[PDB]
Symmetry: C4
Subunit: 462 residues, 4 copies
């Protein structure tokens, strides 16, 4: 019994697609270039016939994945009936050797050799898989699919066109017979290289003009091949345009955003400190790829029982190490952890201005900042904060404008919390506002500062 997702089974898959690439080269070559068996190739041909014999002896069962349950179905019957519904005679007769066919019909040599190209469904499913896969980048996958179909079309056309040249009385006034007088006397590698040269030169529309059609059957095949090439080249340029437009869109929108904001700052004559705070923020929003750019861009599309657990993994020790949440509850901790906004901040940037409306408070993870107070125009720092300290809580828990300006003097990470979101959580778990006010004003009674807020809040209650 063999199930998928098996590392003994994917070896078998990759070995089969290598044999498919073998057949993709060989079957047109036998169709267009060979009448006789020529055992220097035909021995290897019968050998890979034996490989496909042991292949079809092995292939009778493997489990699959059904939809609407997404479970693995392996039950030792229906596992071979389903596989023998569709193509069993095809790859069955695909293994009959050429000696058998010449014993049957000694004119359908290459005609029966051509039949083996059902095997290319493996390559099709492989490319569908790799597009569905997330390990290999989309660029090289689409590029490889294009080069495979291009080389296959070139090879098939060179084989068919040499077939048209050979299967003709009067070898002169054929397309190879027009300039090369005696090509049946020259080698097989030479004739294949000349036919592939013709096919490449025709497909890419270079067309030097040696090796051109002379009679009518060559003209008809060349008309349909050039219509095919026109469609194929349009398909290639379309895929390459898609592939470039996807690949350079993020940098494009980033540059347009930067250009618009810097153009705004110049026509309004902003101070340059404000100007490069703007550009520092808008630059750091970009190159935090999969830290803070993809964070709010992908965590939004999660069903909120997942990103609550993501927030519980990344930030839960930090909410046990802040003074305002000492012994409040355990339900309140998970709920406050579940609704933070982890944000980055480049160095030398104010994150709370003085006399703001009270709306947010922040909790550091890393980096440092300074509390900056102004008196009559001179900026004086007050107190540097450390990674793990809450800032902005004075006035948000109250209803007062903010007291100090907070400038991140290094690269930092803060956790924003909106005020009405903070209150709507602590309107629930009633009686826990008491412990929040208690471990606030027992922290405000500390620090030995000239407490004007402490005397104002006690009258503010009653």
């Amino acid at each position: 019994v063999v199930s998928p997702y098996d590392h003994k089974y994917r070896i078998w898959e990759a070995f089969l697609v290598v044999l498919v690439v073998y057949t993709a080269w060989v079957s047109p070559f036998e169709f267009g270039f060979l009448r006789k068996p020529r055992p220097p190739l035909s021995i290897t041909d019968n050998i890979v016939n034996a490989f496909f014999a042991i292949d079809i002896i092995m292939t009778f069962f493997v489990g699959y994945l059904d939809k609407s349950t997404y479970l693995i179905v392996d039950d030792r019957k229906q596992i071979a009936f389903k596989y023998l519904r569709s193509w069993f005679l095809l790859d069955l007769v695909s293994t009959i050797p050429s000696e058998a066919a010449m014993r049957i019909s000694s004119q359908s040599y290459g005609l029966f050799n051509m039949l083996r190209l059902w095997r290319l469904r493996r390559v099709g499913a492989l490319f569908a898989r790799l597009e569905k896969d997330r390990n290999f980048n989309y660029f090289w996958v689409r590029c490889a699919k294009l080069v495979c179909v291009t080389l296959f079309a070139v090879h098939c056309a060179a084989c068919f066109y040499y077939l048209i040249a050979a299967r003709n009385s009067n070898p002169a006034k054929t397309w190879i017979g027009a300039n090369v007088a005696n090509f049946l006397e020259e080698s097989l590698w030479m004739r294949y290289v000349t036919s592939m040269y013709w096919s490449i030169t025709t497909l890419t529309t270079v067309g030097y003009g040696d090796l051109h059609p002379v009679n009518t059957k060559e003209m008809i095949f060349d008309i349909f091949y050039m219509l095919f090439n026109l469609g194929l080249t349009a398909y290639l340029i379309g895929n390459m345009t898609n592939l470039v437009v996807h690949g350079t869109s993020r940098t494009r929108n980033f540059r347009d955003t930067i250009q618009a904001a810097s153009n705004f700052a110049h026509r309004n004559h902003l101070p340059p400190r404000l100007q490069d705070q703007m550009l520092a923020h808008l630059c750091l929003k970009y190159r935090t790829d999969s830290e803070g750019l993809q964070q709010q861009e992908t965590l939004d599309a999660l069903p909120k029982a997942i990103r609550s657990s993501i927030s519980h993994f990344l930030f839960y020790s930090l909410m046990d190490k802040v003074y305002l949440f000492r012994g409040v509850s355990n339900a309140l901790l998970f709920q406050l952890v579940s609704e933070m906004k982890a944000e980055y901040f480049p160095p030398k940037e104010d994150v709370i201005l003085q006399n703001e409306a009270p709306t947010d408070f922040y909790i550091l993870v890393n980096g440092t900042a300074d509390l900056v107070d102004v008196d009559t125009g001179t900026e004086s720092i007050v107190r540097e904060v450390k990674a793990g300290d809450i800032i902005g809580e004075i006035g948000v828990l109250c209803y007062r404008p903010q007291l100090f300006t907070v400038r991140t003097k290094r690269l930092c990470q803060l956790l924003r919390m909106n005020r009405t979101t903070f209150l709507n959580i602590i309107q629930a778990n009633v009686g826990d506002g008491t412990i929040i006010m208690n471990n606030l004003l027992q922290h405000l009674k500390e620090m030995n500062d000239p407490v004007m807020t402490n005397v104002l809040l006690e009258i503010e209650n009653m």
Copy 2:
């Protein structure tokens, strides 16, 4: 009076467009290769003209979808006024046979045969109709339109360039007279194949170099035809590029989403159960085409009197089979059914965590989940729920944090109901939360558990 949207009438339209394809090949061929009528085509010309005369009779009773009413005007007068004011004269004069034209003037055979190309308006209307259809895929419709206009332009150019070769004294020092010494003695099929070969080799810009202009009239025509081909080839690449970019947008955005989120999970070093819950949800959000991905993309655009009846069709027996809604009303059932959000979930995923904020409850359709409680790290299941049961209703009807973690274990389907949305509904039908509390607390006393929720319930009531 024949109506449109009719199965007897569409067959007549399709037979007409088959005759239009006939005329599109034959008329440039007559203009380029023929002087006589040559009755082996004149008979078929008069047959096709007879069918077009039958259709120009038949069109006097066929209704039309008029705008501003979107009804069908079918009244045997003003249904001919619209026809005679639009294009009656041109498909009148397209129907006239050519023996009358040679009876008038023995010069205007080809110039009158070229006038039958007014019939291509049917092809244009057909392609517009097929692009407006939802049955035939847009890809091959655009591909068919491009190949038809390409083949028609190649055919017209081949016939015109052969005409420039023909109506010229000294057949030598023409383009076919340059290499083929005696082309007037060789057959008509040979000359048509050679002109198609020239026109293809020029349009695809292969240009082998034989069959080139040698005098000035051929150079002028070839200049204008190469300019037309430049515009046409750019048009084909533009259409194929559009057709590729629209075809591979969904897979592209899905892959970018998966890449960004898996890139997020690696830098933050999440536990792998969390990591493949994330990837399982983001994968299942894709391949629910026309069940869940198209659901909240198309239902939101509907004017809410439609999606309410869609929700009434799919999920109305289910809300009669839950304990919490027994005999409340019939108005409340329709209102709650109207505002459920059906969502899919891959197996092995938490959908409600323990100690969450009480915001949602869910109703199964299919699949099962498990209530999971943690005490000291060890997590045991409590009560597996069945398809058709409600989870999360405790604490939403109350105001308490959630009690158990709900982990799915099959491909489930849940119906989310928001809390404030739920309370805004039961304020209407006021006095019918009495039955809700009644069949809650009577249900809470059915199973054996701590019924301390009834203790906090009654002190909260009175």
Copy 3:
């Protein structure tokens, strides 16, 4: 002062761009094909120089629309300062006749004739203006710009390459002397046609291979011209791709929406009346181009002082001619008019379901609809409403759920008013709720209906 936006002045501009097209042909032809003045062109050159001297006089009194005021500046000095600082010297030296140039030196004929290509700034400004216009579609504007730059590049390269063939001792063993040895005896039109034929054949990359370079200077020019052609062809395909991708996007997204919703309805097995109600609404949302589709899509971006007066112009007679607003106010009329949502509806579609939540009510503009009441599965129509009547108000002015079901039976236009939006307006102009209730309960006892609310709300009032 001659103003812009002037019909006496635009005709002068159009005549000037006709003269610029003349110069763009003639100046490279004189540079490459001529040495003498040759009066059949010299007369016309001096005429065109006279017209450009007339315009370089006329440009001293013509107003300009400056920025930061968007007002026409007309001052007769500083209207010449702006002109002299911009391009007065270059179109001065473009205007000088060439007989003075041969008076200076008998070598600088063509090199001075090429300097007249400064006049193409008029063409550039013209194409910028026509892109900023809304009367000429963007498609053919971009197409005309592309064919102009392409024809001009072809023409200049043909002239330069004939010049390289001409200015050469041993005229044989040049590119034109390779096949036509006596090319200096054959006509000027013939040599211009063969040069244009070469130049088209190189630019399209057809490249027949006759008329190819034979010495080193021709090879160097041909390398640079083919690099230019590579860039130019990529530019042309890029413009045509932009022009196709924009032009086929609305139909594309409409088709994708139809495909997704019809796919959704199939796998959920909805009843077909529901299914074609969905398709009728989704179709009618599309083909109301600039009636209802562009209405919500463009009125949203307006600053709400404009669309209020748009709503006031379209629908103000209707709110006077409805019974519920008889003698209410005039401020409340303007405010309710300003916040309606005019919406179209296809025939055979329910717009309000029975037992809905009371959220909206509607007012007909045109079209007809029917009330539908059901009790035991039988749909009985109650009362057809006429174009200009309000439906849905019984329950929104009250708080009860809806009482009937309204199916549109023609192409209708309704005006939606949301309930919470309706109540926020009637708080202002207080006391007008009394007259709304008054002409509501006065309206219940109008037809002497078997009422079941007329006493049920007067007990709520009294």
Copy 4:
């Protein structure tokens, strides 16, 4: 220690990329066209190798910007470990002169010279830098990168194909020996020009047909080179298409908006004053490039501690120069300044209608507007307001419909302020509402709208 962001060091970078452009031309030319050392290039080779040896010495002490801190590491050890672990061996071996190679082996001259192309990492990093830079436009950066890779690939193929021509017995029956009889007896410049002509003619797919392959090794190289040119040509067209679609998107969406609004206004038969108010506003919403269009397009994405200071810089003198804010507070001024939405208005446009809902009020920055009042259909101005004065405050501070209609008459700039946003600020700073009412009614009593405003307004108050 040397730092980046330094003008002594960037000049060294530019001089190195000049020497890289030198080596990119010279190394394939030596590989293809030279066997000898030939001191007229060998001297310059040793000079350029000396400069790269100076740079590989100099690079041990130059600071780098590490991630996760965005600071400059400068420590004189581990700043060399990073350099030794990245690419030290490759630009070591690129520096070695070729006389050492001919001391080793007198056949490995060009085979060693081709290894000097490791220096192109300088060019690649330069293009990455210039795309990330915001001073040079993205258009010509991508265009220059494309022409550099195109000319380099052409140059390499020309050198390799001449190498296949040269290293061959029987110089006749090569590709250059086919038409040129004795190419070894002709100049070096001639052979380089002919090889470059072949390589351009093959890459652009013109392909005249002279200079075509005649033996098998040339056919194999030409097959791989035409496949490469197919890939590169699709890549160039894709890049130019990306570049054009991004370059003309703003004008495209603007034109589509203008088209939809003008088409809406025509099918609904609006009065033309309303119609060109619509088009005036929608035009002005475009050509405020980085004044009003990019203003709310970029300030929205800012973390609101930045744009609060932007609003504080641009608009803070104005809030001290308005009568309603005389001595109110100092925190309230910063909060009100922080939440103003500045807009532009084209001339002759109503910005507030009479009998609107009281929702907004506006403060002029620059420009003049008028007040328009209707009596029975005749409208005239009442009072012109000048830049710096507030309009619409009467009735927003109250709860009354508006009193006048405010029409602009120049390019104006107003500051919108929402009513509920205004009240949610003045609920904070309590007691400052008293001074707002006080300096309103002292302004209302002074400004003689004669009696009925001050009297009826005080009836609401007391």
